[PDB]
Amino acid sequence: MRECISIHVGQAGVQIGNACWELYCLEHGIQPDGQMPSDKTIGGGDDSFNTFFSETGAGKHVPRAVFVDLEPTVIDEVRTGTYRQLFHPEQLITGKEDAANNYARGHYTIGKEIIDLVLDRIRKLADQCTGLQGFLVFHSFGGGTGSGFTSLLMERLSVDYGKKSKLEFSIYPAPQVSTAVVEPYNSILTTHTTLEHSDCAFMVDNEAIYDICRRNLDIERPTYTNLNRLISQIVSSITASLRFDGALNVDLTEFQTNLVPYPRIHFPLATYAPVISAEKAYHEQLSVAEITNACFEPANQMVKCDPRHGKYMACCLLYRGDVVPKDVNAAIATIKTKRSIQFVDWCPTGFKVGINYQPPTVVPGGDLAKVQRAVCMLSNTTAIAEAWARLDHKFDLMYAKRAFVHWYVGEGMEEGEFSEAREDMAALEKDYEEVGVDSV
Amino acid sequence: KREHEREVIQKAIEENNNFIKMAKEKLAQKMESNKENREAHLAAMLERLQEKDKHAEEVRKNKELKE
Amino acid sequence: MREIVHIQAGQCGNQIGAKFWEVISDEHGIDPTGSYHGDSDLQLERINVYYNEATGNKYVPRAILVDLEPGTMDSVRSGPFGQIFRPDNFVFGQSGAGNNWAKGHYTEGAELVDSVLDVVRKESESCDCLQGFQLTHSLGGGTGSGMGTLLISKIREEYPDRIMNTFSVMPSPKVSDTVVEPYNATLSVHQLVENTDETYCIDNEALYDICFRTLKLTTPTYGDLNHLVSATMSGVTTCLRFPGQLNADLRKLAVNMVPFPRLHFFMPGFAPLTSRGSQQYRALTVPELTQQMFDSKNMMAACDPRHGRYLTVAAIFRGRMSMKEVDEQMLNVQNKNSSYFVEWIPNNVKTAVCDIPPRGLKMSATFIGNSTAIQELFKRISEQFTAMFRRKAFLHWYTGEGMDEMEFTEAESNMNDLVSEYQQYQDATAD
Numbered sequence: 010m011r012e013c014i015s016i017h018v019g020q021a022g023v024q025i026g027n028a029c030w031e032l033y034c035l036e037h038g039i040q041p042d043g044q045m046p047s048d049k050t051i052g053g054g055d056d057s058f059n060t061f062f063s064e065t066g067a068g069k070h071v072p073r074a075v076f077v078d079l080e081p082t083v084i085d086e087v088r089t090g091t092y093r094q095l096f097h098p099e100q101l102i103t104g105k106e107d108a109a110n111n112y113a114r115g116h117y118t119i120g121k122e123i124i125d126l127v128l129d130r131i132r133k134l135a136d137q138c139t140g141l142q143g144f145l146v147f148h149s150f151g152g153g154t155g156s157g158f159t160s161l162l163m164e165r166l167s168v169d170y171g172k173k174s175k176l177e178f179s180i181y182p183a184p185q186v187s188t189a190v191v192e193p194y195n196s197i198l199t200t201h202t203t204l205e206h207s208d209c210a211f212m213v214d215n216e217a218i219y220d221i222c223r224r225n226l227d228i229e230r231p232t233y234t235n236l237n238r239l240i241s242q243i244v245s246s247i248t249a250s251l252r253f254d255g256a257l258n259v260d261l262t263e264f265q266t267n268l269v270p271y272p273r274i275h276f277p278l279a280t281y282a283p284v285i286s287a288e289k290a291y292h293e294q295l296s297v298a299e300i301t302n303a304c305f306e307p308a309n310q311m312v313k314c315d316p317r318h319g320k321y322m323a324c325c326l327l328y329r330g331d332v333v334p335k336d337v338n339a340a341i342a343t344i345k346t347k348r349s350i351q352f353v354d355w356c357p358t359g360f361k362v363g364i365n366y367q368p369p370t371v372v373p374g375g376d377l378a379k380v381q382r383a384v385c386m387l388s389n390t391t392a393i394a395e396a397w398a399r400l401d402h403k404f405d406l407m408y409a410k411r412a413f414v415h416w417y418v419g420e421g422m423e424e425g426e427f428s429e430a431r432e433d434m435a436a437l438e439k440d441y442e443e444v445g446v447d448s449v
Numbered sequence: 450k451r452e453h454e455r456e457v458i459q460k461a462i463e464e465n466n467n468f469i470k471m472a473k474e475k476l477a478q479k480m481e482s483n484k485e486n487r488e489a490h491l492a493a494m495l496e497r498l499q500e501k502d503k504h505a506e507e508v509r510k511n512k513e514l515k516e
Numbered sequence: 517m518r519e520i521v522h523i524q525a526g527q528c529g530n531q532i533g534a535k536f537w538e539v540i541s542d543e544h545g546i547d548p549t550g551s552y553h554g555d556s557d558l559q560l561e562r563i564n565v566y567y568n569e570a571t572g573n574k575y576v577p578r579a580i581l582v583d584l585e586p587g588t589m590d591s592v593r594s595g596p597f598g599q600i601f602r603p604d605n606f607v608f609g610q611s612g613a614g615n616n617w618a619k620g621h622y623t624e625g626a627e628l629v630d631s632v633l634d635v636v637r638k639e640s641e642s643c644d645c646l647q648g649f650q651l652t653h654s655l656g657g658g659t660g661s662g663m664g665t666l667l668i669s670k671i672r673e674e675y676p677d678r679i680m681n682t683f684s685v686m687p688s689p690k691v692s693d694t695v696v697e698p699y700n701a702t703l704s705v706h707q708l709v710e711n712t713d714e715t716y717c718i719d720n721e722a723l724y725d726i727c728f729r730t731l732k733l734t735t736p737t738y739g740d741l742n743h744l745v746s747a748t749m750s751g752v753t754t755c756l757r758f759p760g761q762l763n764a765d766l767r768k769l770a771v772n773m774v775p776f777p778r779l780h781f782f783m784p785g786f787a788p789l790t791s792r793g794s795q796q797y798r799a800l801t802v803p804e805l806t807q808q809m810f811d812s813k814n815m816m817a818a819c820d821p822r823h824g825r826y827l828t829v830a831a832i833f834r835g836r837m838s839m840k841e842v843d844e845q846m847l848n849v850q851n852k853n854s855s856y857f858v859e860w861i862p863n864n865v866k867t868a869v870c871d872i873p874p875r876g877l878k879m880s881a882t883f884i885g886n887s888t889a890i891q892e893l894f895k896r897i898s899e900q901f902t903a904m905f906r907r908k909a910f911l912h913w914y915t916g917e918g919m920d921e922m923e924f925t926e927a928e929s930n931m932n933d934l935v936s937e938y939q940q941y942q943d944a945t946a947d
């Protein structure tokens with residue numbers, strides 16, 4: 010048991026979902042038709058991969074997942090694509106009219122028409138769990154559905170499932186691939202609304218991923234496909250602790266204990282390595298020391314910010330592949346003596362380490378070199394508040410003129426909701442400032 | 450001690466229930482307030498158009514009473 | 517899919533309307549009979565946005581053809597692709613409005629409008645999920661202007677939550693010497709500012725200036741003006757008609773382009789615009805292409821963007837080209853022309869690239885700007901309006917239909933407010 014249900018919301022959530030589940034299948038040896046020859050227990054089981062996959066009597070391994078979008082064309086590609094046999098038709102849910110990059114339409118006008126159906130389908134999955142751990146919710150900040158519907162769903166999930174854990178993978182907007190001027194509005198609105206209902210949220214800065222694809226993989230103009238394959242590797246690293254077993258494989262929930270010192274301070278910074286092309290990986294072994302060192306290069310971060318000018322409240326290292334504790338300990342020792350790693354005075358300075366022996370996997374036709382060992386660092390740093398600061402400033406510029414606000418008001422929202430949301434974000438920035446101040 | 454133990458878990462239950470309750474009520478309130486607002490905005494739009502219809506009748510009436 | 521219902525009213529509306537359908541039918545591989553004879557699946561992917569499917573795998577434009585002049589009915593039907601339109605979607609009066617806005621809006625056009633609504637309703641009821649409407653018309657005449665704006669109000673009443681988009685041809689003395697056109701235009705703008713979500717300002721002044729100066733045509737026919745319009749209309753609807761990320765529907769476009777409800781009048785633009793002599797795109801580079809589309813000479817509205825600021829911009833590049841180069845050049849333009857983009861709307865310029873180029877060009881760029889400089893258009897009309905209204909010239913044409921001169925005053929005032937509002941946000945600063 011300890012099942013995990015994934016919910017993929019809007020285009021970004023769905024398309025990232027595609028990449029994640031394809032990768033999971035390849036990591037576990039699950040075919041596109043759902044068959045898994047190595048699984049000798051037919052129709053069920055309590056293996057580690059069962060946290061993410063249920064099983065049918067016919068031997069099909071089915072993602073514990075729901076895909077939701079307010080228009081049909083993205084999910085329609087799942088329905089007709091390579092892994093269409095993987096999902097039951099009822100797991101893939103679509104409306105006919107999207108939120109038009111408007112939080113109001115995602116949370117209210119359009120979202121309300123489909124929310125009950127979505128919850129019913131999620132309930133169907135939950136009732137098949139013997140020990141449900143919680144939910145993972147994938148969505149953009151900037152889209153109308155990703156922002157508006159997600160926050161509606163999170164509110165309703167808190168009612169129907171209480172304090173059952175809810176984690177987010179949230180796509181933070183970047184101008185290189187953004188599709189709406191109002192994405193700062195949608196971002197602040199959903200962040201405010203979801204804050205009390207989320208236990209932990211992994212922000213993914215599209216610009217950070219964009220830069221990584223350009224610099225480390227020599228991709229001239231990254232597409233969502235490029236971005237999502239990288240993002241999936243990082244999500245896989247984080248969930249691998251749940252999907253594989255091993256003596257040194259520390260569960261994500263245990264990292265969470267360290268990562269969340271106060272309820273609102275639940276936004277870890279993810280850093281991943283190695284991201285390297287096949288051309289450059291050839292005849293190049295990246296050691297434990299090398300990939301570990303790369304975790305403190307801000308260019309490898311999932312969110313653009315500078316931890317060297319902030320304070321740490323936690324540092325977690327999630328290794329996978331050919332890695333043993335001896336080498337990790339040596340690597341960390343070196344880093345302790347050379348890097349800019351200052352902790353707040355109220356938390357221990359020790360790094361928490363987990364190791365999963367299953368090696369990193371890559372999708373065919375991908376950009377990433379297949380490597381023998383990889384690492385994802387999860388740190389709690391005051392620096393991540395930079396991301397809030399940038400968004401909040403963009404919000405302030407437009408809202409001072411009430412630009413585009415009539416679109417939200419026309420859908421029933423009030424200016425009070427905007428100022429309330431913005432005030433919460435101001436308080437959040439203040440929170441990250443306060444935790445960094447020394448104790449009396 | 451047993452009494453304290455009972456009071457701790459009871460408090461845990463009550464806080465969880467209060468969180469669920471308040472989340473339920475706040476959402477119900479928001480959806481209702483939102484529906485009222487949208488309905489009012491659409492209603493005000495249609496009323497403006499109805500006034501145009503009224504004005505057009507008056508224009509056509511004005512034409513008749515000049516010939 | 518997400519259906520759009522097209523309406524075309526009056527001579528101008530039907531002329532540019534027919535050209536629009538000719539151009540996009542070719543792009544989608546639709547022939548004048550309605551049969552698909554193309555090769556690319558991209559052509560059929562979003563065909564239902566503009567086309568209904570019929571028996572024998574025929575594709576029929578979701579188009580409604582309106583005019584008080586019965587003659588234009590035959591003009592369309594006799595033209596190329598004239599046979600593709602649904603017979604029952606032709607709605608006709610018995611005589612033109614004679615450039616009388618009042619006739620089109622309050623009397624004779626008001627007598628015909630229910631017949632048009634019946635056709636709208638029939639088309640709309642067969643939609644999986646109607647997203648909105650698209651009207652082509654002139655503001656200078658009587659039917660397209662008067663009856664067209666009546667239609668908008670009546671449609672809005674029955675479809676208040678759908679998007680209303682117009683392609684509005686603005687009058688110019690350089691093309692038409694009809695003296696009442698400033699009245700009809702002002703009365704129309706009075707309606708459009710209140711009842712449309714987005715309006716493309718197709719300025720005959722600009723169309724003439726482009727043909728005369730740039731393309732060096734001594735005598736421009738309406739056919740030559742309409743080539744610019746049709747090319748523009750193809751460009752600004754590309755994101756609606758082919759698979760893509762940016763502004764893929766009418767509402768998303770409006771949400772990206774309209775920061776304030778009244779300020780929804782766009783300056784369209786197109787590149788390349790070059791004579792057959794010299795360049796016909798012989799190494800017009802992405803940099804050159806990009807600089808041209810941001811120049812005054814390439815705007816379909818006779819306004820200088822450097823006399824104002826952009827609130828929002830949409831740029832659509834078409835053809836095979838480097839997306840990296842497009843990205844770099846769009847950044848470059850914004851960097852070097854920073855003053856001309858409002859600082860209090862971050863990232864207000866959005867860019868799309870469509871692999872499918874228009875007919876006869878290897879690459880092109882289409883421009884949609886919400887510029888405060890559009891006030892130059894309204895000021896031009898306002899000046900011409902005043903010259904007439906101070907003398908109450910030809911005013912008996914309109915009062916004769918039952919109008920009051922107070923409505924002229926209010927229309928003039930509302931358009932003047934629009935100008936000062938565009939000026940307000942032009943002068944605004946972040947600090």
Ligand SMILES: *[C@H]1[C@@H](C)[C@H]2[C@@H]([C@H](O)[C@H]3[C@H]4[C@H]([C@H](OC(C)=O)[C@H](OC(C)=O)[C@@]32C)[C@]2(C)[C@H](C[C@@H]3O[C@@H]3[C@@H]2OC(C)=O)C(=O)[C@@H]4O)[C@]2(C)[C@@]1(O)OC(=O)[C@@]2(C)O
Nearest residue numbers: 731733737739740741743744788789790791792875876877
């Ligand atoms: C008027 C005449 C000016 C029109 C002609 C063609 O249909 C037009 C072609 C168009 C020409 O543009 C040039 C050469 O400057 C021109 O259209 C204009 C000037 O507005 C032509 C000859 C072409 C050649 C275009 C292909 C390519 O994109 C280049 C150019 O368009 C532009 C904007 O540069 C074409 O394929 C057009 O066929 C006529 C017949 C004209 O004689 O009367 C019309 O109705 C016309 C516009 O269709």
Ligand SMILES: Nc1nc2c(ncn2[C@@H]2O[C@H](COP(=O)(O)OP(=O)(O)OP(=O)(O)O)[C@@H](O)[C@H]2O)c(=O)[nH]1
Nearest residue numbers: 019020021024107108109110149152153154155233
């Ligand atoms: N990394 C990544 N980001 C994406 C992807 N698709 C969209 N985005 C980002 O998500 C934001 C837009 O939100 P979407 O998910 O496309 O919109 P939506 O959730 O479908 O909401 P609506 O379309 O308005 O109903 C932009 O910032 C995009 O850059 C994707 O596949 N991968």
Ligand SMILES: Nc1nc2c(ncn2[C@@H]2O[C@H](COP(=O)(O)OP(=O)(O)OP(=O)(O)O)[C@@H](O)[C@H]2O)c(=O)[nH]1
Nearest residue numbers: 526527528531612613614615654656657658659660
């Ligand atoms: N660009 C362009 N403008 C046109 C065309 N036809 C007419 N116009 C302009 O439209 C204005 C007159 O409006 P029309 O469309 O001709 O008149 P109408 O809509 O049919 O209304 P009535 O004739 O009065 O019943 C003038 O300013 C013309 O310059 C055209 O084919 N192309």
Ligand SMILES: [Ca+2]
Nearest residue numbers: 048050053054
């Ligand atoms: Ca099993």
Ligand SMILES: [Mg+2]
Nearest residue numbers: 019020107154
């Ligand atoms: Mg979407």
Ligand SMILES: [Mg+2]
Nearest residue numbers: 526527585612
């Ligand atoms: Mg006419």
